[PDB]
Amino acid sequence: AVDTAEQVYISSLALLKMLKHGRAGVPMEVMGLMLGEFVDDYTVRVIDVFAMPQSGTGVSVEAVDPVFQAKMLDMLKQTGRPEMVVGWYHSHPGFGCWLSGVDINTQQSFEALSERAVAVVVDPIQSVKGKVVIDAFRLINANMMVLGHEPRQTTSNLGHLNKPSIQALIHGLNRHYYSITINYRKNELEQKMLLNLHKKSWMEGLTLQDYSEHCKHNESVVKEMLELAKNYNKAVEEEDKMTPEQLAIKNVGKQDPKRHLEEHVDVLMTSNIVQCLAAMLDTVVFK
């Protein structure tokens, strides 16, 4: 009787912990517990996540330790705020985002204690710059398939927005477990304290970058255009011939002065414009 609009909100901070722990044990399958709060009959939100110590050698999520669970949970409450374990996350190095046989088996354990537990898989290698790749999942009852009645009782065009990955579909996707849409919560205090902080400098603006070395860099770059320009002449006559596709493929083994010359010019103009501009700006700021 799920609502196929779960929309598990994760965090602006729980994600960073998930990724950092995932990459730390990249060869293995680290596991942890999600500390979130159920809110609606339609949404489950996580707030914080804490890792569980690795049992040792072996790429598996075999079991959780009850005593460690209690000790940290009973310790976070007395300083932070109480939270209830809502799901567990384990990082798949590069396989993808799905649940294996062991992962399914460990999952029903959590569901037994809590009906709406959510399992999450984080991939720390596939995610590169703007894609994190999580795809939180949950199990489907075997009785339903035996009954044959389709689960999730779709009542909105919200869950069928992400095309399931073919790699995930090969495994028990929509057969032994169903994915739940995952979105994120972001606020200006979080964003402004991260975006306007990551790549910044204090006083590098008014620094003249080793004026002696600056012109030496210019001489080396310009001298490269002397030979580069000469090859440009030899690269214009032989062009504009038949089968330009033949010409296009003919530039797959030898440097093309058309692009190389422009690249050097681009760096040359910006380096001096900035370097020169700082000269006059400084001459007025300081005496």
Binding site: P27, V59, P93, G94, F95
Partner: protein, 51 residues
């Protein structure tokens, strides 16, 4: 550690996501092992007469 993984070092890799998980000593071919722990005879210099 990423300092003992010099070129030529034997390294074990994971089955699913190939990733070095241990540097290993140079292997000894089983023939070479059998080529060393061989002699039970224990012949003494006093038996090879004439030479």
């Amino acid at each position: 550690d990423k300092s003992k993984l010099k070129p030529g070092t034997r390294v074990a890799l994971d089955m699913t996501t190939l990733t070095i998980m241990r540097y290993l000593p140079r292997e000894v071919d089983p023939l070479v092992y059998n080529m060393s722990h061989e002699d039970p005879g224990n012949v003494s210099y006093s038996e090879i007469g004439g030479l």
